[PDB]
Amino acid sequence: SRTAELQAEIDDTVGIMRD
Amino acid sequence: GQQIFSQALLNANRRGEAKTALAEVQARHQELLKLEKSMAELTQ
């Protein structure tokens, strides 16, 4: 569960940096 | 009136040391590879 949460946070940050 | 020796068999039970887990680690590796790829895009 920790790794999936980390993946989710990284995907969100990728979105923010793309913006 | 008799003594005896002793001989080993098995490591765990149903599962064996050759393939101990052999899934809980492989799929995780796939998760970690996904993590690495996403980090690649984020840092870029």
């Binding site: - | 590879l33 690649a40 840092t43 870029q44």
Partner: protein, 141 residues
């Protein structure tokens, strides 16, 4: 001009375009030299760096200079730990090994293996095909 302006970043964007086009035009040595500049400007600043190491080595292989490719691999493995443990380093090693053995099939296998995990862009495909052709030409010769 960007390097004179201390704009390392724009200079690198331009030198990437320059090295890529030079390599596609068969000027593999000069492209490798520009990649060496990109590496040096990027050291201590890493993802692009791995790509730079890989591309440098690929140019050297296309120049049929497997020794320079092996030196580039060793350099990258010593100077940047992320290249040391990267797929790009392992791939460059496998390509150097296949070139030294003259096995164009093993090179094609390693290319497919790499492509399954990290898609080869058109540039890498072109350079890898040139390397394969140089192996096959040595086999045919």
């Amino acid at each position: 001009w960007y390097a004179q302006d201390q704009s390392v970043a724009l200079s690198n964007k331009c030198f990437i375009k320059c090295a890529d086009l030079k390599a596609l035009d068969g000027q593999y040595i000069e492209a490798s030299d520009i990649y060496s500049k990109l590496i040096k400007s990027s050291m201590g600043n890493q993802w692009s760096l791995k790509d730079y190491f890989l591309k440098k080595g690929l140019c050297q292989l296309a120049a049929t200079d497997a020794v320079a490719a092996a030196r580039t691999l060793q350099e990258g493995q010593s100077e940047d730990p992320n290249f040391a443990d990267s797929r790009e380093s392992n791939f460059l090693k496998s390509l150097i090994d296949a070139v030294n053995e003259g096995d164009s099939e093993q090179l094609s296998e390693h290319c497919k293996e790499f492509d399954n995990f990290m898609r080869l862009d058109k540039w890498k495909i072109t350079i890898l095909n040139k390397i394969k052709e140089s192996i096959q030409q040595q086999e045919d010769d």
